[PDB]
């Protein structure tokens, strides 16, 4: 059958595996990457944000971006043939059509990649725990680039695809959401930093508990992929950390499962918190301390200090960060400390 | 400060004075911890996926490993076969020692830089400053994302320690 | 007649310690928000 | 500090219930 013939070709052993998932992955991923490279090189953001964001305009690698569509577009798909662009490619770029282009094709790209992980794992004969782990980056992408702006007024308040643009997104979430005070980001931080810890401490331990399987000072040559023996001493590695740290791994399988668990769980937790922020459901305040501080002008914590910083961030960045609001702040209304 | 909120206070004030985000050393630190978490999840998933069956469905797979056993609990050949096809084979590790070294090297080196980042910004060698870098023909300032970052930094600056400043320039 | 699908349940000491740690730390984190 | 009156009970149950669940599972394992 033609289906079986095509299946043979798609699953051919090549330098770059394709598979059925390749029909979805490769074009979408190529357009997402290409769309970003195109926009950050030529396309501007002058009509959407009032910002320059391409090499053609004078921006560097850190400042270039594919910016979000104007707030007036709402949650429009902004299709090229859509009622906004009306088939005009030039107008389409000027309206922010490339952002949705990247976001959407990038979304189905991530779907194609996770499918690719399933497909290859099925052909090889291994468990699909790599695909499962990849659910955490997806949950992050979906919550932040799709769900969060959908919860808000428009795509405008989604992250713009750029280095400095992301930094804007970071500081925005501090000033407006107090995202640092949210326990769901905290669990994410613990997962990322904890993942980096596990990654560093595992590689270091293994490398420093190696068996002597060679005569050379560089021990990389003393390994063979088809060997049946462990290359490092689990026993010696166990005693070391038992005396240094108090506890230690005794089971290799639980160790590498835990290395999956920590950063994946963290990202999923941070994803949940973003979903909340989409509705402005923030961990912004502690009511108990606001009651105290409002009644007692001598009560002060690092928490009340950070809120003053958020108030500063908001009032000072909003007019330019949200040009569609037409904010006009007279100098006398700006929150300022002494001298500065 | 030795506290959770105090830590956040340290980060916010730092950004307003050093622009640590636009500093290539914090960016290497971010690449070190994101990559660390990635590779940690990556190594964890590939080894778990290539675990040799020693147990049934009614028990944990962890009991397929005994402490101090001679044999490796997983198949690196199969694992490399998978990840080598996920991208291309020459982008995958067949050497467990070389692989694990990379696992140690990447986040350590990354954190080394972000450590030096704080250490160098301590002597006020701050992050990249592209404020008003783009200018049109007439002379009007064409803002970028950097200028928006600046506006946010202005907000922290003028508000941080609202009573401690008596002079217009924040030096100490 | 007994049910042949029944199975014993286990939880070793290590899983207990890990589990208790997960709970105690989650408690320490979220308690402040409960009291608010 | 004027905190939530349910903060104490919600925190106490959040600790006790799942931790008890674990303790129960452990003791019946060592007895096996």
């Amino acid at each position: 059958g033609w289906f079986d013939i095509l299946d043979d070709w798609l699953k051919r052993d090549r330098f770059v595996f394709v598979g059925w998932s390749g029909i979805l992955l490769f074009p979408c991923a190529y357009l997402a990457l290409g769309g970003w490279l195109t926009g950050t090189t030529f396309v501007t953001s002058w009509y959407t944000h009032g910002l320059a964001s391409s090499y053609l305009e004078g921006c560097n690698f850190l400042t270039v971006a594919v910016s979000t569509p104007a707030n007036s577009m709402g949650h429009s798909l902004l299709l090229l043939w859509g009622p906004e662009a009306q088939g005009d490619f030039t107008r389409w770029c000027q309206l922010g059509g490339l952002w949705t282009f990247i976001a959407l094709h990038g979304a189905f790209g991530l779907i194609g990649f996770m499918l690719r992980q399933f497909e290859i794992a099925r052909l090889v004969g291994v468990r699909p725990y790599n695909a499962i782990a990849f659910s955490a980056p997806i949950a992050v992408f979906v919550s932040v680039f799709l769900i969060y702006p959908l919860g808000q007024s428009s795509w405008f308040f989604a992250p713009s695809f750029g280095v400095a643009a992301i930094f804007r997104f970071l500081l925005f979430f501090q000033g407006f959401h107090n995202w640092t005070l949210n326990p769901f980001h905290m669990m994410g931080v613990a997962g990322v930093l904890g993942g980096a810890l596990l990654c560093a401490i595992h590689g270091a331990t293994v490398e420093n508990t190696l068996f002597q399987d060679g005569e050379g000072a560089s021990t990389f040559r003393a390994f063979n992929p088809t060997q049946a023996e462990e290359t490092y001493s689990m026993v010696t590695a166990n005693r070391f950390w038992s005396q240094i740290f108090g506890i230690a791994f005794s089971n290799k399988r639980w160790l590498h499962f835990f290395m999956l668990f920590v950063p994946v769980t963290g990202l999923w937790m941070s994803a949940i918190g973003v979903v909340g922020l989409a509705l402005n459901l923030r961990s912004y305040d502690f009511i108990s301390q606001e009651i105290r501080a409002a009644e007692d002008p001598e009560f002060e914590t690092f928490y009340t200090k950070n809120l003053l910083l958020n108030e500063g961030i908001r009032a000072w960045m909003a007019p330019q960060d949200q040009p569609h609001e037409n904010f006009v702040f007279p100098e006398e209304v700006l929150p300022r400390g002494n001298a500065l | 400060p030795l506290g959770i909120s105090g830590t956040f206070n340290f980060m916010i004030v730092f950004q307003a004075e050093h622009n640590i985000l636009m500093h290539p050393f914090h960016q290497l630190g971010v690449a070190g911890v994101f990559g660390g978490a990635l590779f940690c999840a990556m190594h964890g998933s590939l080894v778990t996926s290539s675990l040799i069956r020693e147990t049934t469905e009614t028990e944990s797979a962890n009991y397929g490993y005994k402490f101090g056993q001679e044999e490796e609990t997983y198949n690196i050949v199969a694992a490399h076969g998978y990840f080598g096809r996920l991208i291309f084979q020459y982008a995958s590790f067949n050497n467990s020692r070389s692989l694990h070294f990379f696992l140690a090297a990447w986040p350590v080196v990354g954190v080394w830089f972000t450590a030096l980042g704080i250490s160098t910004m301590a002597f006020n060698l701050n992050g990249f400053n592209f404020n008003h870098s783009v200018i049109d023909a007439k002379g009007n300032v064409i803002n970028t994302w950097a200028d928006i970052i600046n506006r946010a930094n202005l907000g922290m600056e003028v508000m941080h320690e609202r009573n401690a400043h008596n002079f217009p320039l924040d030096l100490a | 007649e007994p049910n042949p699908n029944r199975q014993p349940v286990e939880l070793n000491r290590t899983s207990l310690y890990l589990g208790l740690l997960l709970i105690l730390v989650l408690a320490l984190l979220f308690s402040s928000y409960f009291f608010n | 500090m004027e905190v939530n009156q349910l903060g104490l009970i919600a925190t106490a149950l959040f600790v006790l219930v799942p931790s008890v669940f674990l303790i129960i599972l452990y003791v019946q394992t060592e007895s096996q």
Partner: peptide, 29 residues
């Protein structure tokens, strides 16, 4: 009462450390 709760949890964690180290499940070869 908030303080007592916070300290109690912290105390339990420290106690858990002691049992997870000195009264752990001994790894056997």
């Amino acid at each position: 009462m908030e303080t007592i709760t916070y300290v109690f949890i912290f105390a339990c964690i420290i106690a858990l450390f002691f049992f997870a180290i000195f009264f752990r499940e001994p790894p056997r070869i």
